[PDB]
XYZ file of C-alpha atoms in Angstrom:
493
model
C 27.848 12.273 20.930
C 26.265 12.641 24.215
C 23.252 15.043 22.308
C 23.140 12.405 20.040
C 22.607 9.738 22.355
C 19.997 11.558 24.438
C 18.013 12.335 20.609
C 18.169 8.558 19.988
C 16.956 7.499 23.440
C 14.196 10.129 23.064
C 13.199 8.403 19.882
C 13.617 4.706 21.051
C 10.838 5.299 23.667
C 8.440 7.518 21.635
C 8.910 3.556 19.183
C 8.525 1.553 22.213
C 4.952 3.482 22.818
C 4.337 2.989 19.255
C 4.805 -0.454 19.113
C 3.317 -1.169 21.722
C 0.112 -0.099 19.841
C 1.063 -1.696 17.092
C 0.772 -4.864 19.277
C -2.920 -3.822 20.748
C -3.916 -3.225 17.062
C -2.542 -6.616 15.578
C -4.324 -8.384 18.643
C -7.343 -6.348 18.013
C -7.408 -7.757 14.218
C -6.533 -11.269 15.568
C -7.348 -12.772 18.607
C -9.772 -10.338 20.427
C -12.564 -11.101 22.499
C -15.575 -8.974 21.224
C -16.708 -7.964 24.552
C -13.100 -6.190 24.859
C -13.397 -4.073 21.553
C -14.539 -1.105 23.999
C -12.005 -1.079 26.509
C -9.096 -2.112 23.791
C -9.891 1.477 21.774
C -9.689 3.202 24.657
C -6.420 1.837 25.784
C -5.085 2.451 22.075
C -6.065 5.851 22.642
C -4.476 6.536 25.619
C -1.162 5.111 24.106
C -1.582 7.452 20.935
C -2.201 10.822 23.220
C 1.224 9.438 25.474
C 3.063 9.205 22.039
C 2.194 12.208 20.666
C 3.030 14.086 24.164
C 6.606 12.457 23.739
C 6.780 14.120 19.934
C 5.713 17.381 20.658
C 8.057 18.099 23.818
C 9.845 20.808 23.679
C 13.044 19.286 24.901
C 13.098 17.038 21.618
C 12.795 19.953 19.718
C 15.813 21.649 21.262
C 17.760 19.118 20.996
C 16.901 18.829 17.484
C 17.695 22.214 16.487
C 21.057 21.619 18.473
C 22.055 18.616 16.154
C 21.201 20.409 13.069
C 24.280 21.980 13.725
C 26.643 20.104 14.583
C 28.839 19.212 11.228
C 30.566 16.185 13.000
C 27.804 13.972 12.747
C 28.211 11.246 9.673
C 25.477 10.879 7.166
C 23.277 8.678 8.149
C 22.865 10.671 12.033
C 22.566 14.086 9.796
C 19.828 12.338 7.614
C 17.948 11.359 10.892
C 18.275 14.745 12.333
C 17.236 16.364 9.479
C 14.011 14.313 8.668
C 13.351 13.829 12.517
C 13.245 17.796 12.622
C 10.824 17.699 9.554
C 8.665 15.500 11.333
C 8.304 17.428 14.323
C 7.877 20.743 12.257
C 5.068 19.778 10.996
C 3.454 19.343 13.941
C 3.957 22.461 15.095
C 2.346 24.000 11.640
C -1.221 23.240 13.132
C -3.041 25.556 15.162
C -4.929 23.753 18.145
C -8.564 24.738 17.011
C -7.534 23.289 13.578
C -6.506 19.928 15.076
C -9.721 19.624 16.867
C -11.981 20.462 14.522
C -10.466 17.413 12.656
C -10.621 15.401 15.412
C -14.762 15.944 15.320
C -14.939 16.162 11.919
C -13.052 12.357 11.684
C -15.658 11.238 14.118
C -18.973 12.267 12.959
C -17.677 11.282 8.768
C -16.990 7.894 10.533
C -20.764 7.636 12.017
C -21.940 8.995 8.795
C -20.151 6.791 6.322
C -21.701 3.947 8.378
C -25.033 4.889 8.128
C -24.775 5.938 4.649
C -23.489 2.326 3.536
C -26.773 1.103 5.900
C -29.190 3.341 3.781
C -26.946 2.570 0.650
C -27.684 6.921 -0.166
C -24.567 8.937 -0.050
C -26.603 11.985 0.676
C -26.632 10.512 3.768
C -22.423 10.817 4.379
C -22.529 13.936 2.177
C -22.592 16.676 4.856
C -20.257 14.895 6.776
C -17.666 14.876 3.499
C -18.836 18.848 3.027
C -17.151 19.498 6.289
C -13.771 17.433 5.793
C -13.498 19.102 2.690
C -13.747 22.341 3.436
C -11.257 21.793 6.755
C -8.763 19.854 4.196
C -8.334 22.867 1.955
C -7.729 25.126 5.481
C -5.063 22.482 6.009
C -3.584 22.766 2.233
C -3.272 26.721 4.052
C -1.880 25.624 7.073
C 0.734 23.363 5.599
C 1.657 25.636 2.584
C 2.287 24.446 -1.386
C 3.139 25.580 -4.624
C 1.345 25.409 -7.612
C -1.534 23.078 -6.794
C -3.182 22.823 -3.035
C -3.422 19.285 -3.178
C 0.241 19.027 -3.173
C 0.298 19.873 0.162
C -1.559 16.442 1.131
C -0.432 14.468 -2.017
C 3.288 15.205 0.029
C 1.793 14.133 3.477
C 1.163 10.623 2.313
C 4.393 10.182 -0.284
C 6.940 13.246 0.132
C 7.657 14.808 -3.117
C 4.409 13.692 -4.793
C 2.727 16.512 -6.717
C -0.475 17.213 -9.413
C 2.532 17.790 -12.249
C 4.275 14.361 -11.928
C 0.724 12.752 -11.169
C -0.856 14.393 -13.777
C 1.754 12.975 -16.021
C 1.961 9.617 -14.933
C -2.267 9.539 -15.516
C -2.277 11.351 -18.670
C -0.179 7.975 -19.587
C -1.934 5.539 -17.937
C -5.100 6.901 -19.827
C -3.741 6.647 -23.722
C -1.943 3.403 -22.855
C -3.836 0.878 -20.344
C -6.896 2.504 -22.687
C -6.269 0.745 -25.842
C -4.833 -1.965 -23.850
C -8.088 -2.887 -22.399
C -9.634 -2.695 -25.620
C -7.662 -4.890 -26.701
C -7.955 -7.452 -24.251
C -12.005 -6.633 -24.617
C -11.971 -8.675 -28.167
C -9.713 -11.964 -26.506
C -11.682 -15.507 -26.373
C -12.564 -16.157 -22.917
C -10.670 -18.608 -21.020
C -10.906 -21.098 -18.448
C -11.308 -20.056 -15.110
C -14.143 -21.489 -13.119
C -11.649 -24.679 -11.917
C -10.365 -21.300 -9.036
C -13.870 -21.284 -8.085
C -13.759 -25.379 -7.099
C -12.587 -26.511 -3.571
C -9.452 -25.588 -2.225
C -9.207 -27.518 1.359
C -8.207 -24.862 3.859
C -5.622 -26.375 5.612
C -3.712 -27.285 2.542
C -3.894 -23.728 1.305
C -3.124 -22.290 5.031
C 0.255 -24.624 4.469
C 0.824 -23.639 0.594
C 0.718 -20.374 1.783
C 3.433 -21.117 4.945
C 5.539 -22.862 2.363
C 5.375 -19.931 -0.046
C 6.295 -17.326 2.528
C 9.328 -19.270 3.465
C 10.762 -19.688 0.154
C 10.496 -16.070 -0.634
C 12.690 -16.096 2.501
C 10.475 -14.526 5.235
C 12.201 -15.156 8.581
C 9.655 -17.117 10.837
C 11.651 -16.722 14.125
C 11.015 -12.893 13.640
C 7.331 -13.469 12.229
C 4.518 -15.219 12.042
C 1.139 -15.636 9.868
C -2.222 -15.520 11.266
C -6.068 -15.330 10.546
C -7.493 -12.030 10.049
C -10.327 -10.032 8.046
C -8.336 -7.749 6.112
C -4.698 -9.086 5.215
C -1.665 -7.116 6.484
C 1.796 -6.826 7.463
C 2.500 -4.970 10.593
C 5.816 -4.530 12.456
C 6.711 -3.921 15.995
C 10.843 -4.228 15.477
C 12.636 -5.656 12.846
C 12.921 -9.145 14.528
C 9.270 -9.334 14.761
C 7.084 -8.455 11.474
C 3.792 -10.321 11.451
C 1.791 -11.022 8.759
C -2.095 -11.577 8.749
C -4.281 -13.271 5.448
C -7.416 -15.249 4.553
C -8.548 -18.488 3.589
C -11.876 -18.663 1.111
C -12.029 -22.280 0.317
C -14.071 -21.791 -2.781
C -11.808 -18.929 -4.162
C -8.144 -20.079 -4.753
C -7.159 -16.451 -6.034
C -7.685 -15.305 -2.771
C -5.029 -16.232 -0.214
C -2.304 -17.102 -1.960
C -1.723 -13.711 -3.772
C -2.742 -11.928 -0.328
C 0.413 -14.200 1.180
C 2.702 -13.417 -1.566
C 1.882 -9.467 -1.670
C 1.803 -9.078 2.698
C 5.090 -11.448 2.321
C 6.606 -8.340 -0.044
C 5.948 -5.844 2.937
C 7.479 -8.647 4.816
C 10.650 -9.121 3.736
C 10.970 -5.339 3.623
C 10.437 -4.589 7.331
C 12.259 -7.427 8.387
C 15.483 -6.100 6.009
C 15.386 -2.159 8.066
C 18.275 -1.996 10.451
C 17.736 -3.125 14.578
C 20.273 -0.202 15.171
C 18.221 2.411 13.422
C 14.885 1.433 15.966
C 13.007 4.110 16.204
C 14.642 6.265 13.485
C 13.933 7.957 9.782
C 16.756 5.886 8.591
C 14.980 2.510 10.261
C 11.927 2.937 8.673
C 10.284 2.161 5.550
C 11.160 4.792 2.580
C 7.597 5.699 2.036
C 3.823 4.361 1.320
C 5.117 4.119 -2.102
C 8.530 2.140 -2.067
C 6.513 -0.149 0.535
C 3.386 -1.094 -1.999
C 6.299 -1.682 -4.517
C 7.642 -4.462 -2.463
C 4.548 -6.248 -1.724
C 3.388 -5.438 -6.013
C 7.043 -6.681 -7.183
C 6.271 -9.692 -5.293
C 2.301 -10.255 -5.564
C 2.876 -9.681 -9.800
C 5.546 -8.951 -11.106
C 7.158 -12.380 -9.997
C 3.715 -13.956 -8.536
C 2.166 -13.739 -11.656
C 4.660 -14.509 -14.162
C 5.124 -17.512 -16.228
C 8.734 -18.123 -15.121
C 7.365 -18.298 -11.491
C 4.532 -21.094 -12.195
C 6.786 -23.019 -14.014
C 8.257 -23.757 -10.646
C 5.120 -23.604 -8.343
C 2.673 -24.921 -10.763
C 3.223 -28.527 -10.752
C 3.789 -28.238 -7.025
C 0.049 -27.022 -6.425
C -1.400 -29.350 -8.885
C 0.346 -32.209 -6.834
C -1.016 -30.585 -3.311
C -4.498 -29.895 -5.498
C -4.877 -32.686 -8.332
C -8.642 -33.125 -7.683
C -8.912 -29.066 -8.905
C -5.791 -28.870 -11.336
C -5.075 -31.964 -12.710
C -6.583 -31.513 -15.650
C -5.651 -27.744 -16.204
C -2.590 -27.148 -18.033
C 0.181 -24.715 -17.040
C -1.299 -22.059 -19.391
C -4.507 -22.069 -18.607
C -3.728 -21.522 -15.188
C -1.376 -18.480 -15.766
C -4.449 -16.618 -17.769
C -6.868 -17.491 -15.338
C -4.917 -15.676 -12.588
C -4.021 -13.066 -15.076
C -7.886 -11.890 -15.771
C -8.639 -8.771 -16.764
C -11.694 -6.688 -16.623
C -13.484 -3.535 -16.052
C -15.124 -3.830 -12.506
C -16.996 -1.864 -9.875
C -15.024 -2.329 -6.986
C -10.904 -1.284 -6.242
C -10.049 -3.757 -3.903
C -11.272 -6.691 -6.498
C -9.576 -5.153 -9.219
C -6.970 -6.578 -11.657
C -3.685 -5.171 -12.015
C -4.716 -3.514 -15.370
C -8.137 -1.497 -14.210
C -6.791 -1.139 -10.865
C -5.032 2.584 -11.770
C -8.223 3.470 -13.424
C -9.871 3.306 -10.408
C -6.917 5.298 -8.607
C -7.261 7.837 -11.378
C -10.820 8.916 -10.679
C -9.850 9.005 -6.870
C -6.868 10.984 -8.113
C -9.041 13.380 -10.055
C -12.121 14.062 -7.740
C -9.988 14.583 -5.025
C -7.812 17.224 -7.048
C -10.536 18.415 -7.779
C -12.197 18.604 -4.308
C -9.152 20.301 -3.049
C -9.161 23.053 -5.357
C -12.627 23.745 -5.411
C -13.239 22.921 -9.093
C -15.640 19.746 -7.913
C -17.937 20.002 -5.330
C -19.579 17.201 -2.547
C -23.215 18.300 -3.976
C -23.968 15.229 -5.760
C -20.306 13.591 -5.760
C -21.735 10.235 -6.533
C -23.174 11.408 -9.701
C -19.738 12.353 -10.665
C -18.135 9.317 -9.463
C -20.726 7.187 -11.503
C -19.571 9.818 -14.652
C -15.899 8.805 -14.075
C -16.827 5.059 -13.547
C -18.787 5.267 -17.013
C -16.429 6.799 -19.166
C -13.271 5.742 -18.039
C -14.151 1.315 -16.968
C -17.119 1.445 -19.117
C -19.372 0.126 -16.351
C -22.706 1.381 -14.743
C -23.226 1.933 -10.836
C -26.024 0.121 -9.585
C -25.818 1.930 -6.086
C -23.669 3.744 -4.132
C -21.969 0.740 -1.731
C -20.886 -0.141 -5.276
C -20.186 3.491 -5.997
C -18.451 6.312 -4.393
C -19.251 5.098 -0.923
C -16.898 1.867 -1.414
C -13.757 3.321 0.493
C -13.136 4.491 3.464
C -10.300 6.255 2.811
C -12.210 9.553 2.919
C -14.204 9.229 6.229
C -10.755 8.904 8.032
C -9.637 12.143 6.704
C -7.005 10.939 3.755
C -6.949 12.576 1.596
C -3.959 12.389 -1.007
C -3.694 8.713 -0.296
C -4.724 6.725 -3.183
C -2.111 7.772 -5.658
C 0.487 5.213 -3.182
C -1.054 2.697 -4.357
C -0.575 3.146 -8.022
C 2.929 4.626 -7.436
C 4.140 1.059 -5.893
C 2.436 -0.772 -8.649
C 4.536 1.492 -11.152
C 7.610 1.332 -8.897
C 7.310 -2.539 -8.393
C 7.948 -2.817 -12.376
C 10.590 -0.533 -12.667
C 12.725 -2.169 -9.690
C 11.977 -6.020 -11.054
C 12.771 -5.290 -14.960
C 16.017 -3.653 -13.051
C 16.503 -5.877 -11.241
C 16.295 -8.576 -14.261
C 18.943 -6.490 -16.252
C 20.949 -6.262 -12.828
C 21.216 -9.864 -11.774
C 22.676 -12.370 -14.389
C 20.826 -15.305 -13.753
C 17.723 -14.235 -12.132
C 14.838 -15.329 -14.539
C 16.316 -18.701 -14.490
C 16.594 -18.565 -10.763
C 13.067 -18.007 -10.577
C 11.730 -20.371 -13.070
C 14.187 -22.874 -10.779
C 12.362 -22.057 -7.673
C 15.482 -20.034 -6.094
C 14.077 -17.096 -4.637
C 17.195 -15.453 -2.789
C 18.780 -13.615 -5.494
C 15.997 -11.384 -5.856
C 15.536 -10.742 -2.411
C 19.648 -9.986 -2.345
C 19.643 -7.547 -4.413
C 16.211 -6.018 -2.833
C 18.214 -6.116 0.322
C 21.483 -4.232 -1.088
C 19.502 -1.852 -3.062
C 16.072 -0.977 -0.891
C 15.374 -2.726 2.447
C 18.502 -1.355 4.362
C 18.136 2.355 3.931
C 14.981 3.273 5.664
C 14.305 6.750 4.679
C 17.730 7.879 3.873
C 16.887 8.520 0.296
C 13.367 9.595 -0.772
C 11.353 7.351 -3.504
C 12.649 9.475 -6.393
C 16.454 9.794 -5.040
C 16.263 5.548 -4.188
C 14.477 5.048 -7.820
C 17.259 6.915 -9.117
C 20.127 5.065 -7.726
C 19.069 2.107 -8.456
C 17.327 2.613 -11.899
C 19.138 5.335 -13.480
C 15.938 7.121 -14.364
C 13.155 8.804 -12.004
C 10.096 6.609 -11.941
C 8.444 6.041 -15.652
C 5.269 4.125 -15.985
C 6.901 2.870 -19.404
C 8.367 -0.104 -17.368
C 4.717 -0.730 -16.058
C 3.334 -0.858 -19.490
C 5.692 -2.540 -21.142
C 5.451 -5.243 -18.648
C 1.605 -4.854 -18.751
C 1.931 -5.899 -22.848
C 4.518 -8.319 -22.655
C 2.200 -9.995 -20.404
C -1.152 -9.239 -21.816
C -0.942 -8.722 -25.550
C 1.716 -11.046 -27.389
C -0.173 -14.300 -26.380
C-alpha cells in the first residue's frame, strides 16, 4: 500500500498544478484586467511546463510499472494504474524534435488563422494548415493505428473512436437526418420573432440561477459568472464553476447555454473527492461529457414535458414578451430547424451535418486523399451538397473554427458522439425510471439526476464510453435512439 500511496500523492500534486491553471484560465475568461493578459499567459505557461515535468519523471514511471504488478490491488486502484500507465506511455511515444516542431507549427497556424479571418482569404492560413498536416500524419506514425491513420487521433480525443464505427454512424446520419430535413423544408413557418423582443438581463441572469438550482447544481461547490464563451470548468469536485451570457434581445441564448454548461455541471460535481487527481476521478471522456450537457440542453430542455413546467413560470417572469404566445408556439420556436452556415449557431438537426464534413475532410486530410490546396473550395462543395447552402466567404466558410489552428485534429466527431449518447442515456433512462416523464412535466428534476449519478457521474474513467454505454443501455451506442427522438420531436406534429 505504501507504492500505492506514494503513486497517489504523485498524482494529487501533478492535479494541484493543474488546477491551479485551471483557476488562472477561469480568471483569465472572467475577471481579468486587460493590461495583465501578457503576464497571465506567461504564468499559465510556466505552470503547464512544471506539470508536464511532474508527468514525465521517471520515478512515476517506475512506480507505475511496479503497480502493474502487484495482483493485490482492488479494481478500481488496478483501473487507475493501468490507464495512469497509458497516459504516461504516450508521452514517451514522441520523439523531442517531433514535439517541437508542433510546438512552432501551433504558433505560427495561430498567427495565421488570425490574419486569414482579417483578410477573410484562407490562402492566407493555408501554408500554415500545409504544415500541421503534414506533421499530423508523422504523428498518426508516431502513435501507431490499424486500418485507417486517423484512428490514431480520432482515439486521442475519445479512446476507442475509429473511421469504421464513424463511418457508420455518418453513413446513418446522412440517409436519415436527410429526408428528415426535407421534410421539415415543406412545414408552415411559425412564430418566432417574440425570442427576438426584450428579455431584461437581470431577470434572465436570475431565470438562469433558478434553473441551475433545480436541475440540482450545488452552489456551495459552484458558482455562475459572465464570460464570452460559456463553459464549465472544474478545479475539484467541491468547486465546478460555470460561465454563460446574457443577449437581451435573444432569449435562445442564455438559457440553453445555462441548461447545457449546468449538464457538464452536475457531472463534475458527481466524480469522487477521493479519486482527486485520478483516471477513476475524472470525466469518462469528451464524449460521455457532451452527453451530459446535450441530455440536459435537449433532450429534457427542449421537450414538451419540460415547458409544461417552466413555461408558465417564464411567461409570469416575462408577460410583456410571452403573454400572448401559447405553450406550443413557444416549444417550435425553440425547436427551429434549418440549414445554416455556421456550427456553433446550429440546430440540433444540421448540427451533425456540419460535424460530418469536418469528419470527412479531416479523414481525408489524414490519409492524403484531400489536400490543403484549395480546402475552402472543398469545404464550400460539402456545405453545398450536404446543407444546401452557398458560402459567401471564408469567415463563413472553412475558416469558422479554430479547432484546426490549435492542432486538433480528430476532435469534432465528440461533439456529435454526446449528442447521440445524450439520447440513448435519456430514452434509457425513461424506460429505467418509473415515473420520470411525469416527474419532469411536474418540475422534479432529481430523479433524473439520481439515476445519472448511479449510472455515469461516479465512475470517472473506470469504464470507457462504449463499456459505460453498454452497462447501462444494453446495446453499444446506436444513433437509432437519436433519430427516433429527432422524429418524435420533429415530424408527428
Amino acid at each position: 500500500a505504501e507504492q500505492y500511496a506514494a503513486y497517489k500523492q504523485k498524482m494529487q500534486k501533478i492535479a494541484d498544478v493543474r488546477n491551479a491553471i485551471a483557476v488562472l484560465g477561469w480568471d483569465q475568461e472572467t475577471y481579468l484586467p486587460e493590461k495583465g493578459a501578457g503576464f497571465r499567459g506567461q504564468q499559465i505557461t510556466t505552470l503547464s511546463t512544471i506539470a508536464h515535468e511532474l508527468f514525465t519523471a521517471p520515478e512515476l514511471g517506475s512506480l507505475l510499472h511496479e503497480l502493474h504488478h502487484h495482483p493485490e490491488l482492488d479494481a478500481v486502484q488496478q483501473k487507475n494504474i493501468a490507464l495512469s500507465l497509458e497516459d504516461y506511455d504516450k508521452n514517451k511515444k514522441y520523439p523531442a524534435s517531433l514535439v517541437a516542431e508542433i510546438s512552432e507549427a501551433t504558433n505560427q497556424a495561430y498567427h495565421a488563422w488570425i490574419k486569414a479571418r482579417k483578410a477573410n482569404d484562407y490562402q492566407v492560413f493555408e501554408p500554415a494548415l500545409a504544415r500541421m498536416v503534414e506533421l499530423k500524419r508523422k504523428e498518426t506514425t508516431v502513435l501507431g493505428y490499424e486500418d485507417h491513420p486517423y484512428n490514431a487521433l480520432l482515439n486521442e480525443y475519445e479512446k476507442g473512436a475509429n473511421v469504421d464505427m464513424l463511418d457508420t454512424i455518418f453513413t446513418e446520419v446522412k440517409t436519415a437526418l436527410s429526408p428528415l430535413l426535407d421534410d421539415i423544408a415543406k412545414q408552415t413557418p411559425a412564430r418566432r420573432d417574440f425570442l427576438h423582443l426584450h428579455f431584461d438581463r437581470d431577470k434572465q441572469w436570475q431565470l438562469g440561477i433558478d434553473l441551475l438550482r433545480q436541475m440540482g447544481y450545488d452552489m456551495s461547490a459552484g458558482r455562475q459568472d459572465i464570460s464570452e464563451h460559456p463553459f464549465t470548468t472544474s478545479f475539484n469536485p467541491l468547486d465546478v464553476r460555470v460561465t454563460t451570457r446574457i443577449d437581451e434581445n435573444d432569449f435562445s441564448n442564455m438559457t440553453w447555454s445555462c441548461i447545457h454548461e449546468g449538464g457538464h455541471a452536475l457531472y463534475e460535481q458527481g466524480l469522487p473527492t477521493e479519486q482527486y487527481g485520478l483516471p477513476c476521478g475524472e470525466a469518462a471522456s469528451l464524449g460521455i461529457h457532451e452527453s451530459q450537457s446535450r441530455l440536459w440542453e435537449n433532450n429534457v430542455g427542449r421537450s414538451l414535458n419540460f415547458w409544461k413546467f417552466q413555461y408558465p413560470r417564464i411567461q409570469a417572469l416575462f408577460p410583456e414578451q410571452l403573454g400572448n404566445v401559447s405553450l406550443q408556439e413557444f416549444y417550435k420556436a425553440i425547436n427551429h430547424v434549418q440549414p445554416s452556415l455556421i456550427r456553433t449557431e446550429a440546430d440540433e438537426i444540421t448540427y451533425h451535418f456540419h460535424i460530418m464534413i469536418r469528419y470527412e475532410i479531416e479523414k481525408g486530410l489524414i490519409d492524403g486523399s484531400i489536400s490543403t490546396k484549395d480546402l475552402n473550395k472543398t469545404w464550400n462543395d460539402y456545405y453545398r451538397q450536404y446543407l444546401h447552402v452557398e458560402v459567401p466567404n471564408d469567415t463563413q466558410g472553412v475558416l469558422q473554427d479554430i479547432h484546426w489552428s490549435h492542432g486538433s485534429f480528430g476532435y469534432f466527431p465528440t461533439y456529435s458522439l454526446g449528442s447521440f449518447y445524450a439520447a440513448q442515456f435519456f430514452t434509457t433512462a425513461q424506460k429505467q425510471v418509473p415515473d420520470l416523464d411525469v416527474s419532469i412535466a411536474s418540475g422534479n428534476y432529481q430523479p433524473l439526476l439520481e439515476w445519472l449519478r448511479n449510472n455515469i457521474h461516479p465512475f470517472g474513467r473506470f469504464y470507457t464510453s462504449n463499456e459505460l454505454c453498454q452497462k447501462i443501455t444494453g446495446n453499444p451506442l446506436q444513433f437509432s435512439y437519436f433519430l427516433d427522438y429527432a422524429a418524435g420531436k420533429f415530424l408527428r406534429g
